Amino acid sequence: KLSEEQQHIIAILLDAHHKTYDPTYADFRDFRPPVRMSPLSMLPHLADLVSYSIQKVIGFAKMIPGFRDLTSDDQIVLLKSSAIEVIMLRSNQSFTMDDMSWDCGSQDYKYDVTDVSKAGHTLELIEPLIKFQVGLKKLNLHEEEHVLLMAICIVSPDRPGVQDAKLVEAIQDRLSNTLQTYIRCRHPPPGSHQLYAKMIQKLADLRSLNEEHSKQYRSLSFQPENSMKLTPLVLEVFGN
């Protein structure tokens, strides 16, 4: 029961996602190698992974209908504030509930709770992060719901620093309408309502994970020997 406009929105987002996500994980061989050992031995590899992913988030966001028609300032604010949330969402594709890990084609590129620890983060982030990944995986989202959720996350009108909040809200409302209609096409009530509510809660969970990651990133990047291990893009996007 999707309108032509709603189908059009979904088609654009699926195209944007397929252009900005490579499921073979070929580029992972180009990062600084993982090392499981010296404090922060996984920070170089995981910083390169996050930096690479920020580029993908930017490439996806620029295809969201209307996003490039916002001011450059609002585009920058939206990407700086949502990048970490979208990375957490995008990572769920390779997350497996057997062993609470992220598999990316090889044993070198399989990440667990310990690797995130070896990038500098503590359990106050890692525990709720794993809980989020488990709750998201059990939703068994279709790719259509996945790309809509990431797009909704990016065009959030309540981000600090947004000037044209009404314009941002206009985009998000169209994405939300499309997601709700897609859910209704697949599920009768009340399962329709329960699934959408759980998706809303996951967006709320991501905001809490954002805050905690920001706290720990500020504590980590404050030390110049830690910032030395990051990338220029990570410093620019996550900075100030």
């Binding site: 580029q55 930017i58 490439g59 620029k62 490039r68 450059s72 300032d73 585009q75 920058i76 990407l79 700086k80 220029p232 893009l233 620019e236 996007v237």
Partner: peptide
């Protein structure tokens, strides 16, 4: 404001 690499990827 000061985000040349982000702006470049946005074009």
């Amino acid at each position: 404001k000061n985000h040349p690499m982000l702006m470049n990827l946005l074009k």
